[PDB]
Ligand binder design. Sequence first.
Ligand SMILES: Nc1nccc(-c2c(-c3ccc(F)cc3)ncn2C2CCNCC2)n1
Ligand SMILES: NS(=O)(=O)c1ccc(N2C(=O)CCC2=O)nc1
Ligand SMILES: N[C@@]12C[C@H]3C[C@@H](C1)C[C@](O)(C3)C2
Ligand SMILES: [Ca+2]
Ligand SMILES: [Ca+2]
Ligand SMILES: [Ca+2]
Ligand SMILES: [Ca+2]
Length: 345
Amino acid sequence: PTFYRQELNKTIWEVPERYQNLSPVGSGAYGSVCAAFDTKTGHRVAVKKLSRPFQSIIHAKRTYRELRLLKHMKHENVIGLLDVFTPARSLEEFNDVYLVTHLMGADLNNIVKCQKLTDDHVQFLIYQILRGLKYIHSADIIHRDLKPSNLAVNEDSELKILDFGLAYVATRWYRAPEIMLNWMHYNQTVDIWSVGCIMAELLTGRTLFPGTDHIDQLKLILRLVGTPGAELLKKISSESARNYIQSLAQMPKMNFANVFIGANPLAVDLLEKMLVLDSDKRITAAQALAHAYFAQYHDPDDEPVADPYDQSFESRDLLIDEWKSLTYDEVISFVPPPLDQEEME
Ligand SMILES: Nc1nccc(-c2c(-c3ccc(F)cc3)ncn2C2CCNCC2)n1
Ligand SMILES: NS(=O)(=O)c1ccc(N2C(=O)CCC2=O)nc1
Ligand SMILES: N[C@@]12C[C@H]3C[C@@H](C1)C[C@](O)(C3)C2
Ligand SMILES: [Ca+2]
Ligand SMILES: [Ca+2]
Ligand SMILES: [Ca+2]
Ligand SMILES: [Ca+2]
Protein backbone atom coordinates (compact mmCIF):
# COMPACT_ATOMS: atom_id res chain seq x y z
CA PRO A 1 0.00 0.00 0.00
CA THR A 2 1.07 3.58 -0.71
CA PHE A 3 1.50 5.72 2.39
CA TYR A 4 1.16 9.49 2.64
CA ARG A 5 2.35 11.98 5.23
CA GLN A 6 0.23 14.56 7.00
CA GLU A 7 1.06 16.83 9.91
CA LEU A 8 -1.54 16.29 12.65
CA ASN A 9 -1.17 17.48 16.25
CA LYS A 10 2.16 19.07 15.30
CA THR A 11 3.72 15.77 14.17
CA ILE A 12 3.96 13.73 10.97
CA TRP A 13 1.52 10.86 10.60
CA GLU A 14 2.33 8.31 7.89
CA VAL A 15 -0.78 6.36 6.91
CA PRO A 16 -1.95 4.09 4.08
CA GLU A 17 -3.96 5.74 1.32
CA ARG A 18 -6.84 3.52 2.47
CA TYR A 19 -7.48 5.96 5.35
CA GLN A 20 -8.49 9.44 4.26
CA ASN A 21 -9.62 12.78 5.67
CA LEU A 22 -7.85 12.47 9.01
CA SER A 23 -8.78 15.01 11.65
CA PRO A 24 -7.78 15.08 15.33
CA VAL A 25 -10.26 13.92 17.97
CA GLY A 26 -8.05 13.97 21.05
CA SER A 27 -5.39 12.15 22.99
CA GLY A 28 -5.61 8.52 24.04
CA ALA A 29 -3.47 6.43 26.36
CA TYR A 30 0.14 6.89 25.22
CA GLY A 31 -0.97 8.31 21.87
CA SER A 32 -3.22 10.68 19.97
CA VAL A 33 -6.27 9.89 17.85
CA CYS A 34 -7.69 11.03 14.52
CA ALA A 35 -11.00 10.25 12.91
CA ALA A 36 -10.70 8.96 9.34
CA PHE A 37 -12.68 7.57 6.43
CA ASP A 38 -11.86 3.95 5.50
CA THR A 39 -12.13 3.94 1.70
CA LYS A 40 -12.12 0.12 1.60
CA THR A 41 -15.43 -0.25 3.44
CA GLY A 42 -16.92 3.24 3.60
CA HIS A 43 -16.78 3.09 7.40
CA ARG A 44 -15.63 5.81 9.77
CA VAL A 45 -12.67 4.81 11.92
CA ALA A 46 -10.45 6.19 14.66
CA VAL A 47 -6.67 5.87 14.21
CA LYS A 48 -4.40 6.10 17.24
CA LYS A 49 -0.72 6.88 16.66
CA LEU A 50 1.28 5.68 19.65
CA SER A 51 3.63 8.28 21.10
CA ARG A 52 7.29 7.16 21.12
CA PRO A 53 6.31 3.48 21.45
CA PHE A 54 9.90 2.20 21.84
CA GLN A 55 11.58 5.09 23.68
CA SER A 56 12.29 2.99 26.77
CA ILE A 57 11.54 -0.38 28.29
CA ILE A 58 8.46 1.22 29.85
CA HIS A 59 7.13 2.44 26.51
CA ALA A 60 8.09 -0.73 24.66
CA LYS A 61 6.34 -3.09 27.06
CA ARG A 62 3.25 -0.90 27.27
CA THR A 63 3.11 -0.86 23.45
CA TYR A 64 3.22 -4.66 23.38
CA ARG A 65 0.70 -4.83 26.22
CA GLU A 66 -1.80 -2.58 24.46
CA LEU A 67 -1.50 -4.31 21.10
CA ARG A 68 -1.85 -7.78 22.65
CA LEU A 69 -4.86 -6.67 24.67
CA LEU A 70 -6.66 -4.99 21.80
CA LYS A 71 -6.02 -7.94 19.47
CA HIS A 72 -7.77 -10.17 22.03
CA MET A 73 -10.84 -7.98 22.67
CA LYS A 74 -13.81 -9.07 20.53
CA HIS A 75 -16.94 -7.66 22.18
CA GLU A 76 -19.48 -5.06 21.08
CA ASN A 77 -19.01 -2.97 24.26
CA VAL A 78 -15.19 -3.11 24.33
CA ILE A 79 -12.74 -1.29 22.07
CA GLY A 80 -11.10 -3.73 19.67
CA LEU A 81 -9.07 -3.61 16.46
CA LEU A 82 -10.11 -3.22 12.84
CA ASP A 83 -6.51 -2.77 11.72
CA VAL A 84 -2.98 -2.16 12.91
CA PHE A 85 -0.28 -0.74 10.68
CA THR A 86 3.20 0.66 10.49
CA PRO A 87 5.01 2.47 7.66
CA ALA A 88 8.03 0.26 8.39
CA ARG A 89 9.00 -2.26 5.73
CA SER A 90 11.05 -4.39 8.14
CA LEU A 91 11.82 -4.79 11.84
CA GLU A 92 14.99 -2.74 11.35
CA GLU A 93 12.82 0.21 10.21
CA PHE A 94 10.10 -0.33 12.82
CA ASN A 95 9.48 2.63 15.14
CA ASP A 96 5.81 3.64 14.80
CA VAL A 97 2.52 1.82 15.52
CA TYR A 98 -1.00 2.88 14.52
CA LEU A 99 -4.14 1.19 15.88
CA VAL A 100 -7.52 1.41 14.11
CA THR A 101 -11.00 0.93 15.61
CA HIS A 102 -14.57 1.94 14.77
CA LEU A 103 -15.14 5.68 15.19
CA MET A 104 -16.99 6.66 18.38
CA GLY A 105 -17.89 10.34 18.36
CA ALA A 106 -18.02 11.18 22.06
CA ASP A 107 -17.42 10.08 25.63
CA LEU A 108 -19.99 9.61 28.37
CA ASN A 109 -19.54 13.22 29.52
CA ASN A 110 -20.80 14.23 26.03
CA ILE A 111 -23.78 11.85 25.81
CA VAL A 112 -26.47 13.33 23.56
CA LYS A 113 -29.53 14.08 25.67
CA CYS A 114 -32.68 16.19 25.75
CA GLN A 115 -32.35 18.23 28.99
CA LYS A 116 -32.04 15.12 31.18
CA LEU A 117 -31.48 11.39 30.69
CA THR A 118 -34.52 9.15 31.05
CA ASP A 119 -34.26 6.14 33.32
CA ASP A 120 -34.63 3.83 30.30
CA HIS A 121 -31.61 5.50 28.73
CA VAL A 122 -29.55 5.34 31.93
CA GLN A 123 -30.38 1.62 32.08
CA PHE A 124 -29.04 1.14 28.55
CA LEU A 125 -25.81 3.05 29.23
CA ILE A 126 -25.02 1.20 32.47
CA TYR A 127 -26.09 -2.15 30.98
CA GLN A 128 -23.52 -1.75 28.22
CA ILE A 129 -20.72 -0.89 30.67
CA LEU A 130 -21.55 -3.99 32.70
CA ARG A 131 -21.68 -6.22 29.62
CA GLY A 132 -18.22 -5.02 28.59
CA LEU A 133 -16.92 -5.49 32.12
CA LYS A 134 -18.28 -9.03 32.31
CA TYR A 135 -16.26 -9.80 29.20
CA ILE A 136 -12.98 -8.21 30.26
CA HIS A 137 -13.24 -9.53 33.82
CA SER A 138 -13.75 -13.06 32.46
CA ALA A 139 -10.25 -12.82 30.91
CA ASP A 140 -8.76 -11.62 34.24
CA ILE A 141 -8.43 -8.08 32.84
CA ILE A 142 -9.38 -5.20 35.14
CA HIS A 143 -9.82 -1.59 34.15
CA ARG A 144 -8.78 0.06 37.47
CA ASP A 145 -9.54 3.60 36.24
CA LEU A 146 -13.04 3.38 34.79
CA LYS A 147 -14.66 6.81 34.43
CA PRO A 148 -16.85 8.71 31.92
CA SER A 149 -13.86 9.85 29.86
CA ASN A 150 -12.86 6.17 29.38
CA LEU A 151 -16.26 5.25 27.90
CA ALA A 152 -16.52 5.94 24.19
CA VAL A 153 -20.06 6.59 22.95
CA ASN A 154 -21.48 7.02 19.46
CA GLU A 155 -24.43 9.01 18.13
CA ASP A 156 -26.88 6.23 19.06
CA SER A 157 -25.65 5.87 22.67
CA GLU A 158 -23.76 2.66 21.91
CA LEU A 159 -20.86 2.46 24.32
CA LYS A 160 -17.42 0.83 24.49
CA ILE A 161 -14.95 0.60 27.36
CA LEU A 162 -11.44 1.73 26.55
CA ASP A 163 -8.06 2.21 28.15
CA PHE A 164 -8.56 -0.89 30.34
CA GLY A 165 -5.76 -3.16 31.50
CA LEU A 166 -3.11 -0.46 31.11
CA ALA A 167 -0.51 1.11 33.43
CA TYR A 168 -1.32 14.92 33.25
CA VAL A 169 -3.64 15.06 36.29
CA ALA A 170 -6.41 12.45 36.27
CA THR A 171 -9.72 12.64 38.05
CA ARG A 172 -9.92 10.25 41.00
CA TRP A 173 -13.63 10.79 41.65
CA TYR A 174 -14.62 7.40 40.15
CA ARG A 175 -11.77 5.28 41.49
CA ALA A 176 -12.43 2.44 43.88
CA PRO A 177 -11.33 3.34 47.42
CA GLU A 178 -8.94 0.39 47.48
CA ILE A 179 -7.22 1.82 44.37
CA MET A 180 -7.20 5.51 45.29
CA LEU A 181 -5.77 4.67 48.73
CA ASN A 182 -3.39 1.85 47.70
CA TRP A 183 -4.95 -0.87 49.83
CA MET A 184 -3.07 -4.15 49.90
CA HIS A 185 -5.59 -6.25 47.94
CA TYR A 186 -8.47 -5.82 45.52
CA ASN A 187 -10.38 -7.72 42.87
CA GLN A 188 -12.23 -7.12 39.62
CA THR A 189 -15.04 -5.36 41.51
CA VAL A 190 -12.88 -2.21 41.71
CA ASP A 191 -14.58 -1.44 38.41
CA ILE A 192 -18.05 -1.95 39.91
CA TRP A 193 -17.42 0.87 42.38
CA SER A 194 -16.68 3.07 39.37
CA VAL A 195 -19.93 1.96 37.69
CA GLY A 196 -21.80 2.98 40.84
CA CYS A 197 -20.16 6.42 40.78
CA ILE A 198 -20.98 6.84 37.08
CA MET A 199 -24.58 5.67 37.43
CA ALA A 200 -25.16 7.92 40.45
CA GLU A 201 -24.04 10.92 38.40
CA LEU A 202 -26.27 9.94 35.45
CA LEU A 203 -29.26 9.89 37.82
CA THR A 204 -28.58 13.12 39.76
CA GLY A 205 -26.51 15.24 37.38
CA ARG A 206 -23.89 15.73 40.10
CA THR A 207 -20.59 14.08 40.89
CA LEU A 208 -21.10 11.56 43.68
CA PHE A 209 -17.75 12.05 45.48
CA PRO A 210 -16.13 15.30 44.26
CA GLY A 211 -13.28 15.29 46.78
CA THR A 212 -10.56 17.94 46.59
CA ASP A 213 -7.92 15.40 47.68
CA HIS A 214 -7.85 11.75 48.70
CA ILE A 215 -8.71 12.53 52.34
CA ASP A 216 -11.63 14.76 51.34
CA GLN A 217 -12.83 12.12 48.89
CA LEU A 218 -12.66 9.38 51.54
CA LYS A 219 -14.71 11.54 53.92
CA LEU A 220 -17.38 12.06 51.24
CA ILE A 221 -17.43 8.30 50.63
CA LEU A 222 -17.79 7.48 54.33
CA ARG A 223 -20.68 9.95 54.67
CA LEU A 224 -22.66 7.89 52.15
CA VAL A 225 -21.63 4.33 53.01
CA GLY A 226 -20.91 4.68 56.73
CA THR A 227 -17.83 4.09 58.86
CA PRO A 228 -16.17 0.74 58.08
CA GLY A 229 -15.47 -2.00 60.57
CA ALA A 230 -12.11 -3.13 61.85
CA GLU A 231 -12.06 -5.90 59.23
CA LEU A 232 -11.49 -3.27 56.53
CA LEU A 233 -8.39 -1.97 58.34
CA LYS A 234 -6.83 -5.38 57.59
CA LYS A 235 -6.42 -4.16 54.00
CA ILE A 236 -4.46 -0.97 54.77
CA SER A 237 -0.70 -1.15 55.28
CA SER A 238 0.00 2.39 56.52
CA GLU A 239 -0.48 2.74 60.28
CA SER A 240 -1.03 6.50 60.03
CA ALA A 241 -3.80 5.89 57.49
CA ARG A 242 -5.43 3.21 59.65
CA ASN A 243 -5.14 5.39 62.77
CA TYR A 244 -6.74 8.27 60.89
CA ILE A 245 -9.74 6.26 59.66
CA GLN A 246 -10.21 4.64 63.06
CA SER A 247 -10.09 8.10 64.68
CA LEU A 248 -12.95 9.49 62.58
CA ALA A 249 -16.29 10.05 64.27
CA GLN A 250 -18.62 7.16 63.53
CA MET A 251 -21.12 7.76 60.74
CA PRO A 252 -24.14 5.66 59.81
CA LYS A 253 -24.75 4.41 56.32
CA MET A 254 -27.24 6.62 54.51
CA ASN A 255 -30.50 5.31 53.08
CA PHE A 256 -29.77 5.64 49.36
CA ALA A 257 -33.48 6.29 48.76
CA ASN A 258 -32.88 9.62 50.56
CA VAL A 259 -29.88 10.43 48.34
CA PHE A 260 -31.29 9.53 44.91
CA ILE A 261 -34.67 11.17 45.39
CA GLY A 262 -37.28 10.16 42.84
CA ALA A 263 -35.08 7.54 41.20
CA ASN A 264 -36.40 4.18 40.04
CA PRO A 265 -36.35 2.00 43.19
CA LEU A 266 -34.54 -0.67 41.18
CA ALA A 267 -31.79 1.84 40.39
CA VAL A 268 -31.42 2.64 44.08
CA ASP A 269 -31.24 -1.05 44.92
CA LEU A 270 -28.50 -1.67 42.36
CA LEU A 271 -26.51 1.31 43.66
CA GLU A 272 -26.73 -0.13 47.19
CA LYS A 273 -25.16 -3.33 45.84
CA MET A 274 -22.34 -1.57 43.94
CA LEU A 275 -21.32 1.19 46.37
CA VAL A 276 -20.05 -1.08 49.13
CA LEU A 277 -16.66 -0.49 50.72
CA ASP A 278 -16.09 -4.25 51.19
CA SER A 279 -14.88 -5.25 47.72
CA ASP A 280 -15.66 -8.90 48.53
CA LYS A 281 -19.32 -7.97 49.16
CA ARG A 282 -19.64 -5.86 45.99
CA ILE A 283 -21.87 -7.20 43.20
CA THR A 284 -19.98 -8.56 40.18
CA ALA A 285 -20.62 -7.45 36.61
CA ALA A 286 -22.30 -10.75 35.71
CA GLN A 287 -24.51 -10.52 38.80
CA ALA A 288 -25.43 -6.91 38.01
CA LEU A 289 -26.55 -7.87 34.49
CA ALA A 290 -29.17 -10.17 36.04
CA HIS A 291 -30.56 -7.39 38.25
CA ALA A 292 -34.16 -6.39 37.55
CA TYR A 293 -33.07 -2.80 36.76
CA PHE A 294 -31.89 -4.12 33.36
CA ALA A 295 -34.83 -6.46 32.73
CA GLN A 296 -35.77 -4.86 29.40
CA TYR A 297 -32.21 -5.23 28.03
CA HIS A 298 -30.84 -8.41 29.64
CA ASP A 299 -30.26 -11.30 27.24
CA PRO A 300 -28.08 -14.15 28.56
CA ASP A 301 -27.39 -15.37 25.00
CA ASP A 302 -25.79 -12.00 24.17
CA GLU A 303 -23.61 -11.45 27.27
CA PRO A 304 -20.54 -13.47 26.30
CA VAL A 305 -17.30 -14.16 28.10
CA ALA A 306 -13.80 -13.87 26.63
CA ASP A 307 -11.44 -16.50 25.32
CA PRO A 308 -8.59 -17.25 27.74
CA TYR A 309 -5.96 -14.51 27.71
CA ASP A 310 -2.29 -15.37 28.31
CA GLN A 311 -0.71 -12.58 30.38
CA SER A 312 2.45 -14.48 31.34
CA PHE A 313 4.50 -11.77 29.60
CA GLU A 314 3.62 -9.31 32.39
CA SER A 315 6.02 -10.95 34.83
CA ARG A 316 8.93 -10.88 32.34
CA ASP A 317 11.66 -8.27 31.97
CA LEU A 318 12.86 -8.29 28.36
CA LEU A 319 15.18 -5.98 26.46
CA ILE A 320 13.72 -3.10 24.45
CA ASP A 321 14.50 -4.81 21.16
CA GLU A 322 12.77 -7.99 22.35
CA TRP A 323 9.56 -6.09 23.16
CA LYS A 324 9.92 -4.32 19.81
CA SER A 325 10.32 -7.60 17.90
CA LEU A 326 7.40 -9.19 19.76
CA THR A 327 5.29 -6.12 18.91
CA TYR A 328 6.33 -6.32 15.25
CA ASP A 329 5.30 -9.99 15.25
CA GLU A 330 1.87 -9.00 16.58
CA VAL A 331 1.51 -6.30 13.90
CA ILE A 332 2.42 -8.69 11.08
CA SER A 333 0.21 -11.54 12.32
CA PHE A 334 -2.90 -9.40 12.82
CA VAL A 335 -5.94 -10.74 10.95
CA PRO A 336 -8.67 -8.12 10.39
CA PRO A 337 -12.12 -9.27 11.48
CA PRO A 338 -14.98 -9.66 9.02
CA LEU A 339 -16.87 -6.43 8.45
CA ASP A 340 -20.12 -8.12 9.57
CA GLN A 341 -19.53 -10.41 12.57
CA GLU A 342 -23.11 -10.58 13.86
CA GLU A 343 -26.32 -12.46 13.06
CA MET A 344 -29.96 -12.09 14.02
CA GLU A 345 -30.71 -13.75 17.36
N1 LIG B 1 -13.20 8.92 18.54
C1 LIG B 1 -12.72 7.73 18.94
N2 LIG B 1 -13.34 6.61 18.51
C2 LIG B 1 -12.84 5.45 18.92
C3 LIG B 1 -11.74 5.37 19.76
C4 LIG B 1 -11.15 6.57 20.17
C5 LIG B 1 -10.01 6.59 21.08
C6 LIG B 1 -8.93 5.75 21.19
C7 LIG B 1 -8.52 4.60 20.36
C8 LIG B 1 -8.09 3.39 20.93
C9 LIG B 1 -7.69 2.34 20.12
C10 LIG B 1 -7.71 2.51 18.77
F1 LIG B 1 -7.33 1.47 17.97
C11 LIG B 1 -8.11 3.67 18.16
C12 LIG B 1 -8.51 4.72 18.97
N3 LIG B 1 -8.15 6.15 22.27
C13 LIG B 1 -8.75 7.21 22.79
N4 LIG B 1 -9.88 7.52 22.11
C14 LIG B 1 -10.80 8.63 22.43
C15 LIG B 1 -11.76 8.30 23.57
C16 LIG B 1 -12.68 9.47 23.82
N5 LIG B 1 -11.92 10.70 24.09
C17 LIG B 1 -11.05 11.04 22.96
C18 LIG B 1 -10.06 9.93 22.71
N6 LIG B 1 -11.65 7.74 19.76
N1 LIG C 1 -27.97 15.66 44.68
S1 LIG C 1 -29.40 16.34 44.46
O1 LIG C 1 -30.05 16.39 45.74
O2 LIG C 1 -29.20 17.56 43.75
C1 LIG C 1 -30.37 15.28 43.43
C2 LIG C 1 -30.56 15.61 42.10
C3 LIG C 1 -31.31 14.77 41.30
C4 LIG C 1 -31.84 13.62 41.88
N2 LIG C 1 -32.62 12.71 41.09
C5 LIG C 1 -33.69 13.10 40.29
O3 LIG C 1 -34.09 14.25 40.20
C6 LIG C 1 -34.24 11.88 39.61
C7 LIG C 1 -33.37 10.73 40.09
C8 LIG C 1 -32.37 11.34 41.02
O4 LIG C 1 -31.48 10.77 41.64
N3 LIG C 1 -31.68 13.30 43.16
C9 LIG C 1 -30.95 14.13 43.92
N1 LIG D 1 -22.65 13.73 46.72
C1 LIG D 1 -22.93 13.36 48.12
C2 LIG D 1 -23.67 12.02 48.18
C3 LIG D 1 -23.94 11.64 49.65
C4 LIG D 1 -24.82 12.71 50.29
C5 LIG D 1 -24.11 14.06 50.23
C6 LIG D 1 -23.83 14.43 48.77
C7 LIG D 1 -22.78 13.96 50.99
C8 LIG D 1 -21.90 12.89 50.36
O1 LIG D 1 -20.66 12.78 51.05
C9 LIG D 1 -22.62 11.54 50.41
C10 LIG D 1 -21.62 13.26 48.90
CA1 LIG E 1 -31.14 -9.58 22.35
CA1 LIG F 1 -25.09 -9.39 10.19
CA1 LIG G 1 -24.64 -2.33 14.42
CA1 LIG H 1 -31.66 -15.94 21.95
